[PDB]
């Protein structure tokens, strides 16, 4: 019921700013603090900041003071994280949550990757990973979708919407000499019912505002 | 600032054992006034957010499994799973709560050992779609395997391919604890309609002797 939905994902160019929002629901907004932290892979957890929306007080972890601000709307619920001066090491995820006075943040986004790059946006192209009778196993079949040559991530992707969770597997995207990246997603089904069933890849790459839905069929040859 | 340290970085154990962690802060994390001792568990999955385990040391927030209990004072603090279940493959990470900064130690990645299944393989062409664009990419999937170390080498006529692939490896899976792998070999439109046969060919610590996978272009 407490929900914190972050903006999408971005690419920003060095000594450009990001403002990363955190959309509140389910509480009452200026009775809590909003904590933000990153995380690099690798690197782990670091705290940026904290702020209670109910008079905009905000706590910053020195190590970010002067290149984070937070600021919270109480018209809209919405608390915001601007991080300027951006540089290849800012490039992580990005967490806001939520912490009640004396608990622990709780609640915590999605997160939100930054990637700061002077390389611009490219969008996926997306292909079908047809089943066949060469991906088949004892009344089984798998079937997917290939990401192709995107850049920034993350690509996300899931399956009919959500309501086919089962048997996916969504691979971490590669790196192309490019520089771009790709990925895959496969979902293993019955092959019983490859006929009467619909099988649609849903591929979002927010950075680029790409939204691309694939329906994956057997085909005929 | 307090600096939290975790151990060890990783561990591997079987279901149902006993698993425990430590964490240790370069301070002391136990308040006077209310003698709560301010440490905070997360567990973390590859791609998710951190999830709120345990506060105050050992308050377990509503929700979490009694499976999972903190535990420890002052600057010394440890985190027990005292049955591991497969979903609790994770990293646990401490936070100092104390005092401003908050800072968190590295973490503890906890895996999963379990029997050895062998790979199931499969061969996707290159789509119609995809040809048009001026290029062939061909997909080879490694489905549910254990231990993770799969090794696929492509195969085109019978000759192995160097320098045209790229592969990746999944997390460990939360329900069954195996892996699964996707190698893609990519080749312009004009190479791939010069060849007739492409396998991707399999060795795993499952199997006997290689599988292979393959489809004739065209056929």
């Known amino acids: 019921q407490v929900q914190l939905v972050q903006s999408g994902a971005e690419v920003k160019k060095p000594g450009a700013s990001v403002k990363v929002s955190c959309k509140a629901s389910g509480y009452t907004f200026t009775n809590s603090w909003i904590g933000w932290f990153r995380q690099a892979p690798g690197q782990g957890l670091e705290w940026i900041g904290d702020i209670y929306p109910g008079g905009g007080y905000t706590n910053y972890n020195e190590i970010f003071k002067g290149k984070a601000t937070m600021t919270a709307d109480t018209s809209t619920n919405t608390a915001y994280m601007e991080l300027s001066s951006l540089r290849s090491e800012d490039t992580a995820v990005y967490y806001c949550?939520?912490?009640?006075?004396?608990?622990?943040?709780?609640?915590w986004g999605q997160g939100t990757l930054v990637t700061v790059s002077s390389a611009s946006t490219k969008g996926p192209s997306v292909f079908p990973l047809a089943p066949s009778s060469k991906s088949t196993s004892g009344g089984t079949a798998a079937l997917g979708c290939l990401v192709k040559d995107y850049f920034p991530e993350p690509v996300t992707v899931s399956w009919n919407s959500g309501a086919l969770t089962s048997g996916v597997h969504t691979f971490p995207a590669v790196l192309q000499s490019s520089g771009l990246y790709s990925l895959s997603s496969v979902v293993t089904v019955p092959s019983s019912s490859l006929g009467t069933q619909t099988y649609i890849c849903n591929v979002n790459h927010k950075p680029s505002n790409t939204k691309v839905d694939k329906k994956v069929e057997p085909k005929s040859c | 600032d307090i600096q939290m340290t975790q151990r060890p970085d990783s561990l591997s154990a079987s279901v149902g054992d006993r698993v425990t962690m430590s964490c240790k802060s370069s301070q002391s994390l136990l308040n006077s006034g209310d003698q709560k001792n301010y440490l905070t568990w997360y567990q973390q999955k590859p791609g998710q957010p951190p999830k709120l385990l345990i506060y105050?040391?050992?308050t377990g927030e509503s929700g979490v499994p009694d499976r999972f209990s903190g535990s420890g004072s002052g600057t010394d603090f440890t985190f027990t799973i005292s049955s591991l279940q497969p979903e609790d493959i994770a990293t646990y990470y401490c936070?100092?709560?104390?005092?401003?900064?908050?800072?968190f130690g590295q973490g503890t990645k906890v895996e999963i050992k379990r029997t050895v299944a062998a790979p199931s393989v499969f061969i996707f062409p290159p789509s119609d779609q995809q040809l048009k664009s001026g290029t062939a990419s061909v997909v080879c999937l490694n489905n549910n395997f254990y231990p993770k170390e799969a090794k696929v080498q492509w195969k085109v006529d019978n000759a192995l391919q160097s320098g045209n692939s790229q592969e990746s490896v999944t997390q460990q899976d939360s329900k069954d604890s195996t892996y699964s792998l996707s190698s893609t070999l990519t080749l312009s439109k004009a190479d791939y309609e010069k060849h007739k046969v492409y396998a991707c060919e399999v060795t795993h610590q499952g199997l006997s002797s290689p599988v292979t996978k393959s489809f004739n272009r065209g056929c």
């Open positions: 936070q100092n709560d104390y005092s401003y900064p908050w800072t």
């Open positions: 105050w040391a050992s």
């Open positions: 949550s939520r912490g009640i006075p004396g608990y622990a943040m709780d609640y």
